[PDB]
């Protein structure tokens, strides 16, 4: 069997073991948690084995298994240098997601672990499948377990929040389905190798673009459309919020390198000015309203909207630099947003039971270790050099500017306004007076669990910010096949 199926089967084996141990024993919930965490370690172990054996400049799909037994819907699993790092991020994030929420679930612990083990399978799949109809199948199988992850383990406004993400993500995904169905009917299949050969007529590509973009604007999400995220990324449990922002948000970032860039190039080129206008607006309106947010977890959720706009504008630049910067900023947001939900929804909400920023002040005086990590995370969210977030923004903004110079200049306002929301939140909670008077008793500082998941996540952000070539070497050759263009003395050689 292929080694890419081993990534899928392990979480499946782990769900089986959680449901069949109580039959060998009133077993403790501690042993439920250990099995799920070990089984996400193994996926990470395997995924690094896949990465050692990867070939950084091969234009054929790798780790493929020859099926030669065709059906109507067959799983085809290939790994490519444009998808490898999305897989690695998934497998590094899911253990922290489990450890972060280790004592906070308290009830329905089996069901909680079985959903996350299910989620890791489906999100691993969406990066590994070699069809665009297969891509859609897994891109939307994550929807039922997320409706239940929010309504069982979510906060007060959990019911409306779970309806919002499900219904918005269902609606937006059904316009992508109509366009995928058109592509398949014209071409006969949705297997990548046969689609990338095929070139659609301009008018068809103009109508496939309207349909793949409706979906991804719903799933970025852009400003006019993000009302599900400000509910779902907040009412959800801590572990739900980590997966939703780090991994689920990137399903459409990686889905533009497959669905738009190679098969609808003329449409992408001629409509970019519409994308850039939308992207510029969500860099401003989201930045303006991230200043006035009184919910700490909601402030982090709103930050993701402004970040996602920068990478969306990068993936539409037709430049090798904005394309790699978009993947780097997708990865960068993955580690940093994870840490700030760990700070907001998993530490202050553990100790105070509230998310209102009015009750917090001067937390440096009694939690110095929280303050140190909270400040480093806050500076990466502000796009400060030495973090992977700065590199992703620099390259994303450069390509946005080289393609359409006016929108990149309005996108670069982020540099100013991301810094203004990030420092203002940090100053209000850690600094900004003395330990607040609403704290009747003292609050303990970080536990050894809270320290080491923040430390792990922060370490990824810095070392990748110093040596981004750890991720750039795989991207260069594979990214070099989604650029559309020619130069006069370099093309059509004889």
């Amino acid at each position: 069997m292929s080694l890419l199926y081993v990534l899928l089967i392990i979480p499946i084996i782990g769900i089986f073991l959680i449901s069949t141990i109580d039959s060998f024993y009133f077993f403790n919930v501690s042993y439920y948690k250990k099995i799920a965490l070990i089984t996400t370690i193994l996926n990470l172990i395997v995924s690094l084995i896949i990465y050692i054996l990867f070939d950084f400049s091969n234009n054929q799909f790798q780790f493929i298994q020859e099926n030669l037994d065709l059906s109507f819907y067959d799983i085809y699993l290939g790994v490519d240098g444009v998808s490898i790092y999305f897989v690695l991020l998934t497998t590094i994030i899911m253990p922290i997601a489990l450890v972060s929420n280790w004592n906070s679930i308290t009830n329905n612990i089996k069901s909680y672990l079985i959903i996350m083990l299910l989620l890791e399978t489906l999100l691993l799949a969406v990066f590994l499948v070699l069809d665009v109809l297969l891509f859609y199948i897994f891109f939307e199988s994550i929807l039922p377990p997320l409706f239940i992850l929010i309504g069982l383990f979510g906060s007060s406004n959990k019911v409306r929040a779970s309806f919002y993400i499900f219904l918005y993500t269902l609606l937006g995904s059904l316009f992508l389905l109509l366009s995928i169905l058109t592509m398949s009917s014209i071409v006969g299949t949705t297997y990548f190798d046969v689609l990338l050969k095929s070139s659609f007529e301009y008018t068809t590509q103009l109508f496939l673009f309207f349909g793949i973009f409706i979906a991804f604007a719903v799933k970025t999400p852009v400003w006019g459309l993000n009302s599900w995220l400000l509910r779902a990324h907040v009412e959800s449990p801590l572990g739900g919020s980590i997966v939703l922002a780090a991994i689920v948000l990137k399903l459409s970032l990686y889905g533009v390198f497959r669905l738009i860039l190679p098969i609808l190039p003329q449409a992408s080129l001629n409509l970019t000015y519409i994308v850039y206008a939308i992207g510029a607006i969500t860099v401003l309106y989201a930045s303006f309203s991230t200043l006035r947010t009184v919910d700490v977890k909601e402030l982090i959720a709103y930050s993701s909207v402004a970040h996602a706009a920068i990478y969306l504008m990068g993936v539409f630049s037709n430049t090798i630099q904005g394309l790699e910067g978009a993947i780097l900023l997708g990865l960068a947001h993955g580690f940093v947003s994870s840490g700030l939900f760990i700070c907001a929804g998993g530490i202050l909400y553990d100790r105070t039971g509230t998310r209102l920023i009015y009750f917090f002040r001067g937390l440096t005086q009694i939690m110095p270790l929280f303050s140190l990590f909270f400040f480093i995370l806050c500076l990466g969210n502000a796009g400060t050099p030495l973090t992977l977030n700065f590199v992703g923004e620099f390259m994303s903004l450069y390509g946005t500017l080289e393609r359409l110079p006016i929108a990149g200049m309005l996108a670069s306002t982020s540099i100013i306004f991301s810094a203004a929301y990030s420092i203002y939140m940090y100053n209000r909670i850690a600094f900004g007076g003395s330990v607040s008077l609403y704290f009747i008793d003292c609050f303990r500082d970080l536990t050894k669990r809270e320290f080491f998941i923040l430390f792990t996540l922060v370490s990824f952000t810095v070392i990748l910010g110093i040596y981004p070539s750890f991720v750039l070497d795989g991207l260069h050759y594979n990214i070099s096949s989604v650029v559309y263009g020619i130069e006069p003395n370099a093309s059509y050689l004889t």
Binding site: S19, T20, S23, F24
Partner: protein
């Protein structure tokens, strides 16, 4: 995937779900014979689906050749 493998497992999955819906214990020793019976029925149904597959393949093959005569022979008569 292998049909005999999928269907054998499908029968083992059907036993696990039935005990879960009944809330009866999975794996009590004096009832473990159910898993072999459910798996054997899953093996047998699948040997029947392999015979179904074999015949359908012949039929779809013939038809794709017939549509390739109708399109051909019509083009032959349009050459006049």
């Amino acid at each position: 995937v292998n049909r005999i493998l999928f269907w054998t497992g499908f029968g083992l999955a059907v036993r696990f779900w039935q005990l879960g819906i009944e809330m009866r214990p999975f794996f009590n020793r004096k009832s473990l014979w159910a898993y072999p019976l459910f798996g054997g029925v899953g093996a047998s149904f699948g040997y029947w689906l392999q015979s179904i597959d074999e015949k359908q393949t012949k039929m779809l093959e013939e038809r794709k050749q017939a549509i390739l005569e109708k399109r051909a022979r019509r083009a032959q008569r349009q050459a006049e």
